[PDB]
Amino acid sequence: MEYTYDVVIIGSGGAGFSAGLEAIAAGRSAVIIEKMPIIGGNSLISGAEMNVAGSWVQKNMGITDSKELFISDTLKGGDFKGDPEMVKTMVDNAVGAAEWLRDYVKVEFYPDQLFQFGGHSVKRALIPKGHTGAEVISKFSIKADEVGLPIHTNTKAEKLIQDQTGRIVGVEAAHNGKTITYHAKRGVVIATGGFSSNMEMRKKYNPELDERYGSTGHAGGTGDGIVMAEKIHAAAKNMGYIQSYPICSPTSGAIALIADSRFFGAVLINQKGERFVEELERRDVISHAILAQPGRYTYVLWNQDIENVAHTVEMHQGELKEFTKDGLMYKVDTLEEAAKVFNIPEDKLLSTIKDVNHYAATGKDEAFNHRSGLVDLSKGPYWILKATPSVHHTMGGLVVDTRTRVLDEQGKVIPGLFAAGEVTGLTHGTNRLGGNAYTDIIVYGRIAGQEAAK
Amino acid sequence: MEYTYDVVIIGSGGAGFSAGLEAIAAGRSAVIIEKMPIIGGNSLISGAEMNVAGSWVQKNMGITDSKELFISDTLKGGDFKGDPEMVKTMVDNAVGAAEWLRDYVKVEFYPDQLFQFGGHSVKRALIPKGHTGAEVISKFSIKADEVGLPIHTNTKAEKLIQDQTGRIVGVEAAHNGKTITYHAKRGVVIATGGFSSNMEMRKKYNPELDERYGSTGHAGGTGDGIVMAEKIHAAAKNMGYIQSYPICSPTSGAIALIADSRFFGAVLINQKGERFVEELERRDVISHAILAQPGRYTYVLWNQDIENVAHTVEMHQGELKEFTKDGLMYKVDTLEEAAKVFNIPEDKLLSTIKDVNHYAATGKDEAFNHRSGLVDLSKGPYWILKATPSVHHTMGGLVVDTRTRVLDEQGKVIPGLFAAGEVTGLTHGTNRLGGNAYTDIIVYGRIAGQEAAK
Ligand SMILES: Cc1cc2nc3c(=O)[nH]c(=O)nc-3n(C[C@H](O)[C@H](O)[C@H](O)COP(=O)(O)OP(=O)(O)OC[C@H]3O[C@@H](n4cnc5c(N)ncnc54)[C@H](O)[C@@H]3O)c2cc1C
Ligand SMILES: Cc1cc2nc3c(=O)[nH]c(=O)nc-3n(C[C@H](O)[C@H](O)[C@H](O)COP(=O)(O)OP(=O)(O)OC[C@H]3O[C@@H](n4cnc5c(N)ncnc54)[C@H](O)[C@@H]3O)c2cc1C
Ligand SMILES: O=C(O)CCc1cnc[nH]1
Ligand SMILES: O=C(O)CCc1cnc[nH]1
Ligand SMILES: [Cl-]
Ligand SMILES: [Cl-]
Ligand SMILES: [Cl-]
Ligand SMILES: [Cl-]
Ligand SMILES: [Cl-]
Ligand SMILES: [Cl-]
Ligand code: NA
Ligand code: NA
């Protein structure tokens, strides 16, 4: 079996959907091939918070921002190793990308809530309805069906087809045990995501991130797009720069979005019943703090008063059920019971919380200088969750220009080949800031579809 | 020639002076041996700002602090690698150490000024009169003369003398081309400082910090105390953790205390005439930002309005003269002349400063989010200084217990041997916070003299 389209996109995350919608809108034929039985990749299970300087939400909330500050925050976040033009193009197109999600894809964002991730000087992360990528992928899917963009699931790209001039002209993929050839008349877009779930590739480029760590990502995040492109001499860079997320399941590796109560007053308690890090410190600081605690894990503790403002339990009920079944989370009436279920010393926990309650009343955290203010924890019920860092995002990957064209080992454009999203390696330097992956995947996914369709 | 004292102290910095005053006050005989012709080491040329949680100055200024916060700030600053008991003992004794400098040594501190170094949650660094260690060392010297503590300059310790039981019982030192034996009846205190000025030792433990970098320290900061102690099987740790300071002379390596105008509104301008980092970011962030700029240097620019509040020119006139003679600093009437002297593009500098002036008026730095507020730079005169990072402090060194006893490679106390100050390696983890070296050297210098005199 063979198929022919103008634009063949590999991957059904935010980058691939953005490329596909743009290629169809340009009047070209296009397909997305997706190796899993379901669409959306890590973009689906993402928090999907998306940084934008100058958004309609910031305006509603009276928050001023600037592209210059977003650029400088981003470059500094990655230890000044990111490509400045890639960061500039991401920031310059972020407003348009978010307005396009709103107006064309019909993604609903809260009009009056934002997250401030570590390294950001102002609150700037837009929040999709539901606080996950479910809203984004479900709306992308509906729009794709409306506009006539086909998505072939259970179809794994295995080889790029390169003609005698060096142009990439198609993809060989596996489906139901057979090879299918996808001819691409105008371009191939690699939108395959990262390699957080490829243990051997992690260990090759960053030996510390071995079997001691889980992955927050889906099973399909295995680096296939880098491997396929390297076979035709695409360059890669920054492959050793791999980040973890601090608050993840010790059993499955999954992120704990339910623990976004950390942004609303939840406290981090170690096995000794003590507070050990400011709960809103920079992401890697929190991870390193947790790894310095007994057992290399933390507890996250909060109450109903926090849930009534944060809604992270209501929004992440699958996590509640799974973490509870795994013995990693408990809902308890009292602090005494919270200590009992996890063998935390009771007197130390109670003394810690007495201090928290005082700091909440005064607004002055005399132990860790919590930046936004603690909330009284004297009254339950409470959730307590056990968490540890897990591998989360691979900042390295393919070398592209700001037009998403993939470059070879001498910096020459490989005709017909584009790449966008976490598969690329030039935007985030040594360390991606929270909320900046979604900005990257939409901005560059759109550009890739536009360029491939030319 | 031989001498006999109860306590023989090697080094005339803050650690050695603190040990010597305590040994004499305990009723014991003591001497300080100093290899240079002048006293004071790096403690003399230090800014000598000294962190204390709960000081009389904080009380005068209405600033609340806590030992818990100082401990947590410090441990986090060193990536959770510092010894928690060493940090706790430093913090627990900091108030007493500073009050002792004030009341016993007669050091004068400003009653109503503090510095907030990177990583500190609140302003907590006491400032000696003159904003340098000149006040500290000059007062220590006067007190030493009053109490009868001799200091033998031009006397270089070369070998610790160890008896057949393993006890350290003296020091062999060189003076005027001859060896002098110092018998120590009760103890030897190693207070020799760091190794920022030993190129071969830097390259051995941290190969990046090679001849491309200067040192901010005096020529005597060569690691001799570590070498002498290792010869008798003292343990060392953390030797590869070596920090730089961002704003130093490209010619001599010296720190630019005159550029403490950065705490009062001075801006950092690259060769292109642009602002590239928040001027009050964490120290290493500023260093990395500078190394990412063209030429791996920055300019520091400020005006008379800033000097009239900061006084960093008035307080550091030797630096003014030396940096000016070296072609690294200019005093100019106008921004146009500031651009000319360093070949900075004029239009870019003027546009940068127009933005700064607007951000100063609104209090909102839309480029880098300056945390304390910019100051209008429309009116001169101006100073402009060229600066680059230089090697500054060696966090590693000898293994001690909290009683300053030096431990061997199996963790056993070496009888008769104590160490204090930058020569030790367990307090600061991977990264010492600004102002914490002075706290360490006084607290542990006092303990070393007390313990050695027992
Ligand atoms: C749990 C979680 C939470 C996150 N939260 C946030 C957040 O709030 N904000 C933020 O900015 N970032 C966040 N991130 C990161 C961000 O979600 C991802 O980096 C981004 O969604 C990746 O988008 P993508 O389009 O590059 O790849 P993906 O969304 O991973 O899509 C790639 C797709 O390609 C498919 N594919 C791979 N190989 C092949 C092949 N050989 N053939 C066919 N198909 C293939 C995959 O199966 C997958 O469906 C989060 C990540 C995770 C895992
Ligand atoms: C320019 C500068 C600015 C600084 N600013 C600050 C600041 O504001 N706040 C802060 O907390 N820290 C600061 N630091 C760091 C801090 O000043 C030093 O870490 C601290 O002063 C070192 O004290 P010490 O007693 O361990 O050693 P030193 O003060 O260096 O004294 C050691 C002495 O031992 C002598 N010695 C060495 N080997 C031998 C030998 N073989 N025989 C005899 N004598 C020997 C040396 O010659 C020297 O005089 C600064 C450092 C520098 C260089
Ligand atoms: O990885 C990111 O960009 C943010 C992770 C996240 C945590 N809570 C929501 N999103
Ligand atoms: O190295 C330190 O602890 C601070 C350096 C400093 C800069 N200005 C005054 N002191
Ligand atoms: Cl909000
Ligand atoms: Cl961060
Ligand atoms: Cl974050
Ligand atoms: Cl002050
Ligand atoms: Cl710092
Ligand atoms: Cl600092
Ligand atoms: Na990447
Ligand atoms: Na040291």
For A336-349, give the DSSP string. HHHHHHTT--HHHH
All residues at 6 or more sequence positions from B448 whose CB lies less than 8 Å from its CB, including other chains = B15, B18, B19, B22, B189, B191, B404, B418, B419, B420
Residues 6+ apart with CB under 8 A from A417: A160, A168, A187, A188, A190, A229, A232, A234, A405, A406
Residues 6+ apart with CB under 8 A from A448: A15, A18, A19, A22, A189, A191, A404, A418, A419, A420
Q: Which of B285, B291, B369 sits opposite A69 (nearest CB)?
A: B369
Contact status, residue A357 vs residue A379, Cβ threshold 8 Å = no
The position carrying tokens 């130390």 is A348
Q: What is the 3-state secondary structure (H, E, C) of A212-280?
A: CCCECCCCCCCCHHHHHHHHCCECEECCCCEEEEEEECCCCCCECHHHHHHHHCCEEECCCCCECCCCC
Tokens 């962030």 appear where?
B285
- Does the N-terminal peptide bond of residue B381 adopt cis geometry, omega within 30 degrees of 0? yes
- Residue A190's φ and ψ, nearest 5 degrees, are -85, 115
Of B6, B14, B3, nearest to B143 (Cα)?
Answer: B14
Tokens of residue B393, six digits: 């402090």
Question: How far is A292 from chain B, CA to nearest CA, in Å?
Answer: 7
Residue type, A439: T
Say if CB B414 and CB B161 are below 8 A apart: no
Q: Measured between alpha carbons, how far is B412 from B401 in angstroms, rounded to an integer?
A: 10
Question: Which residue type does B241 have?
Answer: Y
Per-residue b or e along B433-451, where b marks 16 or more CB atoms closer than 10 Å to that residue's CB: bbbbbbbbbbbbbbbbbbb
- With the C-alpha atoms ordered B429, B432, B435, B437, is the resulting torsion angle positive or negative? positive
Give dist(CA B306, CA B356) in Å, integer: 14
Mutate-to-test residue for ligand 3 from A244, A255, A436, highest number of ligand atoms within 8 A of CB: A255
Contacting residues for B177 by C-beta, under 8 A, at least 6 apart:
none
Nearest CA of chain A to the CA of B445: how many Å? 28
- The beta-carbon neighbor of B79 closest among A121, A278, A288 is A288
Residue found by looking up tokens 């012709």 in the block: B37
Q: Which amino acid is at B79?
A: D
Q: Using the 8-state DSSP alphabet, how is residue B146 labeled? A: H
From chain A, the residues in CB contact with B371 under 8 A are none
Q: Which of A253, A175, A269 is nearest to A215 (CA)?
A: A253
With contact defined as beta carbons under 8 Å apart, do A233 and A409 qualify? Answer: yes
Residues in CB range of A84: below 8 A, 6 or more apart:
A71, A75
Q: Which of B314, B224, B227, B300 is nearest to B267 (CA)?
A: B300
Distance of CA A309 to the CA centre of its chain: 24
Binding-site annotation: residue ranges of A: 15, 34, 42-43, 47-48, 157, 224, 393, 422, 437
A201 Cα–ligand 12 center, Å: 38
The DSSP 8-state label assigned to residue A182 in this structure reads E
Taking only Cα atoms into account, the Rg of chain B, rounded to an integer number of angstroms, comes to: 22
Ligand 4 atom nearest B393 alpha carbon: 1
Q: Residue A289 and residue B76: Cβ atoms within 8 Å?
A: yes
**Residues of A forming the active site:** 283
Chain A residues inside the 8 Å CB shell of B64: 364, 366
B156 closest CA partner among B211, B96, B87, B225: B225
User: One-letter amino acid identity for A276?
Assistant: F
The response to whether B221 counts as a known ligand-binding position is no
- Three-state SS for A74? helix
Residue A131 near residue A125, CB atoms below 8 Å: no
Q: What DSSP line would sit under A13-60, residue for residue?
A: SHHHHHHHHHHHHTT--EEEE-SSSSS-HHHHHS---EE-TT-HHHHH
Closest CA to A302 of A378, A359, A389: A378
Name the residue in chain B with its Cα closest to that of A121.
B369
Residue that has been written with the tokens 């031009």 in this structure: B154
| Displacement of CA A419 from its chain's centroid (Å) | 17
Is B283 among the catalytic positions?
Answer: yes
Across the interface, whether the CB atoms of A364 and B64 are under 8 A apart is answered yes
Backbone angles phi, psi at A30, to 5 degrees: -160, 160
Structural domain including A380 reads 245-391
Query: Of all helices (H) and strands (E), which one includes residue B447?
Result: helix B436-453
Residue pair B204/B435 in contact (Cβ under 8 Å)? The answer is no
Listed in sequence order, the residues at least 6 apart from A249 whose beta carbon sits closer than 8 Å to its beta carbon are A214, A255, A256, A322, A323, A326, A328, A387, A388, A390
Determine the longest span between alpha carbons in chain B, in angstroms. Answer: 74
CA distance B375 to A444: 39
Residues of chain B with Cβ-Cβ distance to A284 below 8 Å are: none
**Is there a contact between B415 and B168 (Cβ–Cβ < 8 Å)?**
yes
What is d(CA A121, CA B283) in angstroms, rounded to the nearest whole number? 17
* Burial class of residue A410 in the structure, from the number of CB atoms within 10 Å of its CB (0-12 exposed, 13-18 middle, 19+ buried): exposed
Nearest Cα of chain A lies from the Cα of B292 at a distance, in angstroms, of 7
Which of B68, B289, B366 is opposite residue A69, by nearest beta carbon?
Answer: B366
Choice from B17, B35, B42 to test ligand 2 binding pocket (greatest atom count within 8 A of CB): B42
| Residues A397 and A423: beta-carbon distance below 8 Å | yes
Mark yes or no for CB contact A66/B276 under 8 Å. no
Q: Is the CB of A260 under 6 A from ligand 1?
A: no
> DSSP string spanning B329-386?
EEEESSHHHHHHHTT--HHHHHHHHHHHHHHHHHT--TTT--SS-----SS--EEEEE
**What SS3 state is found at B411?**
coil
| Residues making up chain B, counted from first to last | 454
Find all residues with CB under 8 Å of B189, minimum gap 6, and list them.
Answer: B7, B8, B9, B10, B15, B16, B19, B404, B418, B419, B420, B445, B448, B449, B452
CA–CA dist B331, B4 (Å, integer)? 54
Residue B63 near residue B70, CB atoms below 8 Å: no
Nearest Cα of chain A lies from the Cα of B2 at a distance, in angstroms, of 50
Sign of CA pseudo-dihedral A262, A266, A271, A273 = positive
Which residues on chain B are in Cβ contact (under 8 Å) with A68?
366-367
**Domain CATH code at residue A377:** 3.90.700.10
Q: Which of B258, B148, B240 is nearest to B201 (CA)?
A: B240
B chain contacts of residue A291, beta-carbon cutoff 8 Å: 80
Using most ligand atoms within 8 A of CB, pick from B74, B131, B245, B385 the residue to mutate for ligand 4: B245
In three-state secondary structure terms, B325 is helix
Give the Cβ contact number of residue A131 at 10 Å.
23
A122: chain B residues, CB-CB within 8 Å: 369
Distance to chain A for B73, nearest Cα, Å: 8
CB-based contact A176:A404 (threshold 8 Å):
no
Residue A349: HSE in the Cβ half-sphere, 13 Å Cα cutoff: 26
CA dist., res. A159 & res. A157, Å (int) = 6
Nearest CA to ligand 4 atom 9: B47
Experimental technique for the deposited model: X-ray
- What does the alpha-carbon distance between residue A196 and residue A129 come to, in Å, rounded to a whole number? 26
Closest CA to A196 of A185, A205, A183: A205
**Interface size between A and B, measured as CB pairs under 8 A:** 56
Give the integer Cα–Cα distance in Å for B364 and A65: 10
From ligand 9's centre to the CA of A454, what distance in Å? 49
Check: CB of residue A195 under 8 Å from CB of residue A226. Answer: yes
Q: Taking an 8 Å Cβ-Cβ cutoff, which residues of chain B contact chain A?
A: 64, 66, 68-69, 72-73, 76, 79-80, 121-122, 276-278, 281, 285, 288-289, 291-292, 364, 366-369
Going by C-beta distance under 8 Å and a sequence separation of 6 or more, which residues neighbour residue B321?
A: none
List b or e across B367-385, with b for residues whose CB sees 16 or more CB atoms inside 10 angstroms: bbbbeeebbbbeebebbbb
CB A189 within 8 A of CB A418: yes
* Structural contact between residues A13 and A191, judged by C-beta atoms closer than 8 angstroms: yes
Establish whether residue B319 lines the binding site of ligand 4, counting it when its CB lies within 6 angstroms of any ligand atom: no
**What is the CB neighbour count within 10 angstroms for residue B148?**
9
Which residue of the set B283, B405, B432, B446 is catalytic? B283
Taking the C-alpha atoms of residue B15 and residue A224, their distance in angstroms, rounded to an integer, is 58
The radius of gyration of chain A's CA atoms, rounded to the nearest angstrom, is: 22
As a whole number of angstroms, the distance between CA A13 and CA A35 comes to 11
Which phi and psi (to 5°) does residue B300 adopt? -120, 125
CB contact under 8 A, B69 and A292: no
Residues A107, A135 contacting (CB under 8 angstroms) = yes
CA–CA gap between residue A221 and residue A224 (Å, rounded) = 8
CA of B63, nearest ligand number: 8
Binding residues of A for FAD: 15, 34, 42-43, 47-48, 157, 224, 393, 422, 437
Element at B21 (helix H, strand E): helix B14-25
CA of B447 to the centre of ligand 10 (A): 26
Q: Which atom of ligand 1 is nearest to the CA of A435?
A: 11
B163, burial (CB in 10 Å: exposed 0-12, middle 13-18, buried 19+): exposed
